[PDB]
Amino acid sequence: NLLGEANSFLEVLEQVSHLAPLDKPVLIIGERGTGKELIASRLHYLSSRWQGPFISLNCAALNENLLDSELFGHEARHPGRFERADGGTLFLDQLATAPMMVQEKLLRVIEYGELERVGGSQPLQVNVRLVCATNADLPAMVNEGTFRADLLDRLAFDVVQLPPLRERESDIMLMAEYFAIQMCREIKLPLFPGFTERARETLLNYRWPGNIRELKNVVERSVYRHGTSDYPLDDIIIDPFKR
Ligand SMILES: Nc1ncnc2c1ncn2[C@@H]1O[C@H](COP(=O)(O)OP(=O)(O)OP(=O)(O)O)[C@@H](O)[C@H]1O
Ligand SMILES: [Mg+2]
């Protein structure tokens, strides 16, 4: 799924088309629900590595010891995500939550191209194209001492900045209409009856902290609650916890 014709979004797609063929690491900056893993996927499938594996790992999800083992692997065997991504692309989400230990080890892999291993096993050479994502201000975290300056000096070969939905105002009604129509098909309404001006005001004035994921859920819920093709959708249900 890839909607949007806001110039800011089209510029991202152009940038991605040029970055994909490189073996260089790419940093994606963007809020939740803006499509970051989908962009990472595009970088993979437009690259020369497209027939190789596309592996993903969310850094925020795992505790420090588990993240270490999941990313770099362990034995006394559990192949880590770098190993699984050999010949392909590894996507690291919520990068700024990585503990400083993992950050240092990550830089080592990037700069030396091998996974450390003792206990008898020879080191593992890996060939992986890295894509990372975050919505943190990484330069600010470097100043705070919570992100490694040397990792950022190396990792940010270039940066893809995904615009939030609220800065893609023209895409809001375009996407809302698309999601509404899909929901009409799912609940077997003959036609999407349109959005009233009140509904449009509600959609366009909301700041969409959850961006596209949130827009889809809000619109689907609103269409379902409306439940008819006989007149236009007027009530946009942003918050389902209200009664
Ligand atoms: N260009 C797009 N066109 C249509 N839908 C999109 C687009 N980008 C994202 N979405 C929708 O938004 C939802 C979330 O996408 P995605 O997980 O890639 O965002 P994200 O930035 O990775 O969010 P998070 O970081 O919270 O996981 C998906 O269900 C997807 O359908
Ligand atoms: Mg994601």
Curated annotation (Swiss-Prot):
GO molecular function: ATP binding; ATP hydrolysis activity; cis-regulatory region sequence-specific DNA binding; DNA binding; DNA-binding transcription activator activity; identical protein binding; sequence-specific DNA binding
Keywords on record: Activator, ATP-binding, Cytoplasm, DNA-binding, Nucleotide-binding, Transcription, Transcription regulation, Two-component regulatory system
Regulation affecting activity: ATPase activity is inhibited by interaction with PspA. Under inducing conditions, the interaction is disrupted, allowing activation of psp transcription.
Predominant cellular place of this UniProt entry's protein: cytoplasm
GO biological process: negative regulation of DNA-templated transcription; phosphorelay signal transduction system; positive regulation of DNA-templated transcription; regulation of cellular response to stress; regulation of DNA-templated transcription
Keyword Nucleotide-binding carried by entry: yes
Residues binding ATP: 30-37, 85-94
Localization annotation: Cytoplasm
Keyword ATP-binding: yes
Residue intervals of the Sigma-54 factor interaction domain: 9-223
GO terms under cellular component: cytoplasm; protein-DNA complex; transcription regulator complex
Quaternary organization: Forms a complex with PspA, which is composed of around 6 PspF subunits and 6 PspA subunits.
Functional description taken from the UniProt entry: Transcriptional activator for the phage shock protein (psp) operon (pspABCDE) and pspG gene.
Name this protein carries in UniProt: Psp operon transcriptional activator
Originating species: Escherichia coli (strain K12)
Part of the full-length chain shown: 7 to 257 of 325
